Amino acid sequence: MKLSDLRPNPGANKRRKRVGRGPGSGHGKTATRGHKGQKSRSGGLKDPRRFEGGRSTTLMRLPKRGMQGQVPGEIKRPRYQGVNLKDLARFEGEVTPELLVRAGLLKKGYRLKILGEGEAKPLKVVAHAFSKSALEKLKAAGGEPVLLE
Amino acid sequence: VYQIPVLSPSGRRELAADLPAEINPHLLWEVVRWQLAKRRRGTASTKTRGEVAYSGRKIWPQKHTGRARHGDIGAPIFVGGGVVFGPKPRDYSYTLPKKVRKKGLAMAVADRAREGKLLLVEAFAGVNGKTKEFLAWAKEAGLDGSESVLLVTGNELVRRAARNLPWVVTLAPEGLNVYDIVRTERLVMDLDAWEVFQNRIG
Amino acid sequence: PRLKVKLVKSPIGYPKDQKAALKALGLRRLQQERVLEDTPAIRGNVEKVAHLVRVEVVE
Amino acid sequence: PKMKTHKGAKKRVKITASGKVVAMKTGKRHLNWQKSGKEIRQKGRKFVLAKPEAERIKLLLPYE
RNA sequence: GGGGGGAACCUGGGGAACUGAAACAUCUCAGUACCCAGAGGAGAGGAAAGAGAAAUCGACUCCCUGAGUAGCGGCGAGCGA
RNA sequence: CUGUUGGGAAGCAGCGCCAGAGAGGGUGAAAGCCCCGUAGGCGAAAGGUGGGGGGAUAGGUGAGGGUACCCGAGUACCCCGUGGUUCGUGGAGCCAUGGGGGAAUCUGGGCGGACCACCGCCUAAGGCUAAGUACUCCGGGUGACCGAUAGCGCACCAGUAC
RNA sequence: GAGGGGUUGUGGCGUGCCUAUUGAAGCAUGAGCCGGCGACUCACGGUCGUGGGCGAGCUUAAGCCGUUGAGGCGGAGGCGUAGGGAAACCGAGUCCGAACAGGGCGCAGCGGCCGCAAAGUCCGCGGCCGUGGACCCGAAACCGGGC
RNA sequence: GGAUGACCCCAGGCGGUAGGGGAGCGUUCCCGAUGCCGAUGAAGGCCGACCCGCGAGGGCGGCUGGAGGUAAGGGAAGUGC
RNA sequence: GGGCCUGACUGCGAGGCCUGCAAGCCGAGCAGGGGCGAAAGCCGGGCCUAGUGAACCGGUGGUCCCGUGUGGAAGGGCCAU
Numbered sequence A: 001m002k003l004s005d006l007r008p009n010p011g012a013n014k015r016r017k018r019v020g021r022g023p024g025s026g027h028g029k030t031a032t033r034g035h036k037g038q039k040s041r042s043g044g045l046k047d048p049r050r051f052e053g054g055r056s057t058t059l060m061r062l063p064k065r066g067m068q069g070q071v072p073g074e075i076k077r078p079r080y081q082g083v084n085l086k087d088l089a090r091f092e093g094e095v096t097p098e099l100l101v102r103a104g105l106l107k108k109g110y111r112l113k114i115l116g117e118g119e120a121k122p123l124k125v126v127a128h129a130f131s132k133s134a135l136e137k138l139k140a141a142g143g144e145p146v147l148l149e
Numbered sequence B: 001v002y003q004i005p006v007l008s009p010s011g012r013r014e015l016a017a018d019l020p021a022e023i024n025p026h027l028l029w030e031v032v033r034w035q036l037a038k039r040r041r042g043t044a045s046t047k048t049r050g051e052v053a054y055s056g057r058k059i060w061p062q063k064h065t066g067r068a069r070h071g072d073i074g075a076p077i078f079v080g081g082g083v084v085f086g087p088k089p090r091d092y093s094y095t096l097p098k099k100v101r102k103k104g105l106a107m108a109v110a111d112r113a114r115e116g117k118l119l120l121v122e123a124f125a126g127v128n129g130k131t132k133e134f135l136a137w138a139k140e141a142g143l144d145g146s147e148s149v150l151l152v153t154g155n156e157l158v159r160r161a162a163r164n165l166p167w168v169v170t171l172a173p174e175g176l177n178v179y180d181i182v183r184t185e186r187l188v189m190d191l192d193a194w195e196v197f198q199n200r201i202g
Numbered sequence C: 001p002r003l004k005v006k007l008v009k010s011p012i013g014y015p016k017d018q019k020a021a022l023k024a025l026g027l028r029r030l031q032q033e034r035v036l037e038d039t040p041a042i043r044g045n046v047e048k049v050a051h052l053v054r055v056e057v058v059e
Numbered sequence D: 001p002k003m004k005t006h007k008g009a010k011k012r013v014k015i016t017a018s019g020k021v022v023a024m025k026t027g028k029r030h031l032n033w034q035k036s037g038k039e040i041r042q043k044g045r046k047f048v049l050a051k052p053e054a055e056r057i058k059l060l061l062p063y064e
Numbered sequence E: 001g002g003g004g005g006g007a008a009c010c011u012g013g014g015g016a017a018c019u020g021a022a023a024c025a026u027c028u029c030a031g032u033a034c035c036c037a038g039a040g041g042a043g044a045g046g047a048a049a050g051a052g053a054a055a056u057c058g059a060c061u062c063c064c065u066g067a068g069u070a071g072c073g074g075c076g077a078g079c080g081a
Numbered sequence F: 001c002u003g004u005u006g007g008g009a010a011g012c013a014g015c016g017c018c019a020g021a022g023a024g025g026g027u028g029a030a031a032g033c034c035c036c037g038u039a040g041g042c043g044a045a046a047g048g049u050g051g052g053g054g055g056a057u058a059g060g061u062g063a064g065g066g067u068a069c070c071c072g073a074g075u076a077c078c079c080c081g082u083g084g085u086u087c088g089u090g091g092a093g094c095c096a097u098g099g100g101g102g103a104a105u106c107u108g109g110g111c112g113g114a115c116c117a118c119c120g121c122c123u124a125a126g127g128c129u130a131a132g133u134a135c136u137c138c139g140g141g142u143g144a145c146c147g148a149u150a151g152c153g154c155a156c157c158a159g160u161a162c
Numbered sequence G: 001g002a003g004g005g006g007u008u009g010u011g012g013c014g015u016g017c018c019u020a021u022u023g024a025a026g027c028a029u030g031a032g033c034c035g036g037c038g039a040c041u042c043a044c045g046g047u048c049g050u051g052g053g054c055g056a057g058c059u060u061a062a063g064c065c066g067u068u069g070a071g072g073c074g075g076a077g078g079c080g081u082a083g084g085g086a087a088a089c090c091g092a093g094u095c096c097g098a099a100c101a102g103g104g105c106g107c108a109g110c111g112g113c114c115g116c117a118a119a120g121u122c123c124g125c126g127g128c129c130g131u132g133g134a135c136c137c138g139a140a141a142c143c144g145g146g147c
Numbered sequence H: 001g002g003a004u005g006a007c008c009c010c011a012g013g014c015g016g017u018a019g020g021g022g023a024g025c026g027u028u029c030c031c032g033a034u035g036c037c038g039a040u041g042a043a044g045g046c047c048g049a050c051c052c053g054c055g056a057g058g059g060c061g062g063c064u065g066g067a068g069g070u071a072a073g074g075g076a077a078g079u080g081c
Numbered sequence I: 001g002g003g004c005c006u007g008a009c010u011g012c013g014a015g016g017c018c019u020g021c022a023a024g025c026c027g028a029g030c031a032g033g034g035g036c037g038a039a040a041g042c043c044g045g046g047c048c049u050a051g052u053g054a055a056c057c058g059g060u061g062g063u064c065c066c067g068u069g070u071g072g073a074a075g076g077g078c079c080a081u
Ligand SMILES: [Mg+2]
Pocket: A013, A014, A015, A016
């Protein structure tokens, strides 16, 4: 294969929409902008995700709800990410949050919890918490749950 | 498994080698684009109406002269003024996915294998750092000079020798890249280089 | 995985202890099927009464 | 520069698991004495915003 | 010994407004522009009366990240560790 | 090197040669071998540098026992007015300080987001400190940078003429 | 040099261009003519679509090494793998509730273990959005330091 | 139809501002290129009633010009008045 | 007109009307504890259609959800107003 034989697939490198370059293109003169008003101006138009012409916006008329927090900010408390019995069949022997972190199943600095969606394997499973369902399937499929602190 | 021909001091033997079965011509294009793009210097530049050396005086009053309205002479509508969307210094590099380029490196070598253009050598005889010395070896090796060759070897003497012939690109194996594999018609390597090559594509 | 156990051969004439193993698994009738765990205990009773039993592995 | 999360939205709204936008009902912040308990009760619930408005508030939340 | 100069860069002392908030005053622009004083080849900072929950860490500077997070906000526009 | 065409060979043809040098620019048109270069090497009496190698100096150095002598003052601390911090008076601490009041020397004091207790962290009110960081007047290297209305305002006697 | 080029007497037909407008040949705007300059871009973030890699995983940033137009390493971190709830919390559920009530918001590939496909994620490309002066030209003005 | 644009037949659609999509031409640059065109004449200019293309355009030939130009296929934009 | 009463309920709500949004409207039936009725049943104010005001900021009564090292508290959240 030569260098000149290197090309992309069709559609891999579409050309761009050049506006303002004349009549026969389709985007001459007003460059698809229409006639006058805002929007047609350079820089024009307030953020249309938010702005509604001056009336109170659909967003701002909805009420606030919940704890927002206050200075000095959020409170540091233990946090848990759960992992299911299905997300364990890939292993053998023992399971610990350290090995679950390498796998791409648990996120670092999060305590481990086992949840019950899926088949239970006879595994020795160290974790920080178990759901009732995850305990029953586990302590009744041959495996050893290790609750820890 | 392709059958790569090995040149030897003790006989033309062969050696089974596991290279990708089918080549993805779009992938080799994606690797070469990125190689040739991250090397771009990105030093085109122009000046904006604010970066241009004239002062901001209003040249004449807004109304009543009978001429057009203008501001300062730095506006791009003036000759000698700024340029509107001229190039600025750019970084064209981007992180092509590792697994992609690792694949392209195997697929590029595979194509030359699937062509009888890949040739592995154990050593280079009377060649110790002289271009004549390599020239002789290339004659005994079939490599007359009628075809471009990628010379991949961690022997600097061998590299020094050939690197000046117009039909030879020389490379340390750590430099093996698909662009140079495509650039060239043939491809010659050390078993020291083949050994490394196998390391990288895993 | 689990264990899908089919009882295809009658215990009649086999030792009393092989007959109770059937009863441990909860298998009381020919052509009856119970899906169980794979506990070494549960498995051993399935392995004891292996010759009267056909076993599929699920999960 | 990267986009900034609109903190007015994030304090009024939650993106659901499929991507509906859900808020609280308006109408019970005050003036509730002469309101039937069925009004007080139905307004203490969450609802799904209409799709056009739902997809503007969602653009204001690019990091959820 | 000082004095005065130096393209940008640095620190300190003072310090706007247009503009944005589709009006505007708190807010924003922004401690930005600019003025002044000083420093150099760099300047600042720097060896815990620190962090902040780790029963932990160990000067300071700078980069990546943490993160548009925590929060701040006519809880508006926005601001932002 | 020679022959050929031509004003001119570096083109074309013939027979060679170098290459750790076949980057690039010249030469009468298109030159690896004509020139300047390139690859690879060499070079400082004098001045500047020297963060690296070496040396010199300054400097640095225990253990229990008792004593309670010392441990940075208009300071800490508190109240008032403000600034800094993500913090716009907020539950508003922390850091700094213009005004008032005003300590103690480890059994002292400050902090851990009002406050209190408990548990901890740290030793304020003296100073210095490379390096990693910023910048480009200056020099060099390189451009999918400009090519005389472009590129710096200036390729030229331009901050000039006017 | 059985055709074509120049020219135009007569006949037939015929209201410049651009712009703005319900509507212009318009007695509405612009343009003496010619040549050259002159306006939808870039960064980062987003959101779709699309071309490829990998796929319950995908991927590195700064850097370090290497090259001297050679690539590599680096897993910190980011997105995804679970949701519901103001939260404590629980979890294939969860929240309201006295409830095993009702409801809101959630929860499950294709052919013979091989082969293809796919959540997702990464990079390229394109449309559009946010932040920037953001398609280009234009004020009257406000402020600062000087003259 | 033949077999996935392999080309042929048959049938029907094809006014158009704002605007949406599609397919192309051309400009400068990069890879292709230590190549290839080039003083037996490059680019640019002046003609053309000739050829190809719906068109934007591309050829070809004569004169001028006197040293450059650059393919198939891709890549990037200070890209068309 | 009378007698007894407080459904001028609490926790929900199939399904619709109306509708750019956000609103506005009608609603069977289920559960808790009730009123009236011998009972069938009816009752989540008023013959119907006007008598009204999003969010932000705060007040008050509950709840006992958060409580910046820990226990408390300050301050929030949630429910009602
Ligand atoms: Mg493109």
